[PDB]
Amino acid sequence: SVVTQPPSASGSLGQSVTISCTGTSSDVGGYNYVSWYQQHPGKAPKLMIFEVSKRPSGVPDRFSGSKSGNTASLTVSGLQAEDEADYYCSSYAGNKGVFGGGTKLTVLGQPKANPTVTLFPPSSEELQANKATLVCLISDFYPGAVTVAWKADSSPVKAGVETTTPSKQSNNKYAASSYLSLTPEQWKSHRSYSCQVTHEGSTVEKTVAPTE
Amino acid sequence: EVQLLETGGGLVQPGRSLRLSCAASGFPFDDYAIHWVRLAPGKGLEWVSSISWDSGSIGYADSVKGRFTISRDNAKNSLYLQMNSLRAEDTALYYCAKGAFPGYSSGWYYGLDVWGQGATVTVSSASTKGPSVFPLAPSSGTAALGCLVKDYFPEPVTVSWNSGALTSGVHTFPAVLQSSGLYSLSSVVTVPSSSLGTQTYICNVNHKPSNTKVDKRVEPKSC
């Protein structure tokens, strides 16, 4: 069957957020066996609640469970940075289980994290293959919005730019990457190339040179 | 410690077959019921199948009923899932999970406390192109080095360092789907500077679609 869950939830640091989990009379509203799971990016799920409101060992008191009719709820008080994750509910349904759709929990209004930028020139092996790529890497930043700007010396680059979408890594922080594609002759034509990373009003710039 | 490890993933065409395995350790596999749960990209968790300790109780989801075949070998402490006639919607991340108590439905009663790392399964009829691997050399008290996994199709690629022994300081990044229709990826490790002439750093790129396995030694540039 289908267990309805809102796609996204949000709450500020220290506040509370309730994540609903709606089923029918044959699963959520038919038994007191609702479970809740937390999943950080890149890692296996973790059991947070079982039997509607029971907490295993290792789960803080901030997570609490409740149920009312066909709707089970997970409340997270005193929201913290590490609570940002995906949350799925589970329910028994008669020799079968069923999960909810899942809810992404964003913890709003936390201290920012400055990105660490690293720019790589084209390798000699790629240049020998008559290709050239500039690899700009951006990691350990929060929140996830970031603009990446490429520059040939001081002027903006014309074309050949590819940029990832910022996605959270295993440390629960965001990371992205941008690729500037050039011919070997374009690479050796300009004095320097720059990756400009704008994040939350602050701008970082890394620069490489074909001579240096 | 308790531990579950899934194996047997990869890309396979719609209609073909694929068998998954789950190796268990750290707990009495003889008595517990184990289950399969998958995570489809963009969707959430979805229960796949379940099997009791003696295989006396077996259940499947309606989407894979008469399609998958679950089994186990208690002597080898291994769980299996034979997936035949795979469809595009079968593309997911398959998890091996044990229950809190050895009963069949007890994993639903008290939750699934132990999960494996999962094995990726892709079901698409797409074409295949192997990646070119180039080293991102560092400048000879830390330094950043990596390698460039360029122009491959389709997803995904796995990048380890030093056959998996190098995990600390390894930075992970997502792939670009470039305007050419090909993906590109880069992996980077941060290491102390005083070890560039001492240690050896090798990135292990595995692109199973193309059967491409490259080991590239990344070493400092000679300016």
Author numbering:
A (entry chain L): 2 to 213
B (entry chain H): 1 to 140, 146 to 228
Wording from the paper:
S is the major surface glycoprotein on the SARS-CoV-2 virion and is involved in viral attachment to target cells via the interaction of cell-surface-expressed angiotensin-converting enzyme 2 (ACE2) with the receptor binding site, at the tip of the receptor binding domain (RBD), in the S1 fragment of S (Lan et al., 2020). Following attachment, cleavage of S releases S1, allowing a major conformational change in S2, exposing a hydrophobic loop that executes fusion of viral and host cell membranes, releasing the viral genome to initiate viral replication (Walls et al., 2017). In summary, we have presented a structure-function analysis of potent human antibodies induced by Omicron BA.1 breakthrough infection in SARS-CoV-2 vaccinated individuals.
We have determined structures for five mAbs within the neck/left shoulder cluster: Omi-2, -9, -12, −25, and −42.
